[PDB]
Ligand binder design. Sequence first.
Ligand SMILES: [Cl-]
Ligand SMILES: [Cl-]
Length: 162
Amino acid sequence: MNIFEMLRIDEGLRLKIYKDTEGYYTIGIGHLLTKSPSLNAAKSELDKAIGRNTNGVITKDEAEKLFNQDVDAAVRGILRNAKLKPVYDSLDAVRRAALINMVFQMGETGVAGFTNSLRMLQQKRWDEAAVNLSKSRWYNQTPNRAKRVITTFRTGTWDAYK
Ligand SMILES: [Cl-]
Ligand SMILES: [Cl-]
């Protein structure tokens, strides 16, 4: 299992514009298009992202391409972030994937806001960190996915994904 297969399971794949759990326009493997209510503003961002007139529909290759860009951007955002970088450097390979998953879903800013949990992770206080991570809007809104990520942080194995 790796970051790509993990996110593919959490996000799914859809070749037509759809609305995410928050009601925002999305396409492919969790690629957010816009927070704007306009389906036309979405089609426009999509065409811009792909470099062609898509009329709201993309192929599997196009989806994978966006996905490779998004995972790359998530890692690079973590490495450039003064709050995230030290956390990431301290973790083993599996737990690193867990942190990447949160950043992809919520953005660097949002994750950097989990101050207390980040501190606990750095200190390798696994159980404590899992409890603090659960007291969040994130856990209450997307409980099955949050449990999977949290278990990954608690155990350091891919069990939740098998
Ligand atoms: Cl883009
Ligand atoms: Cl969920």
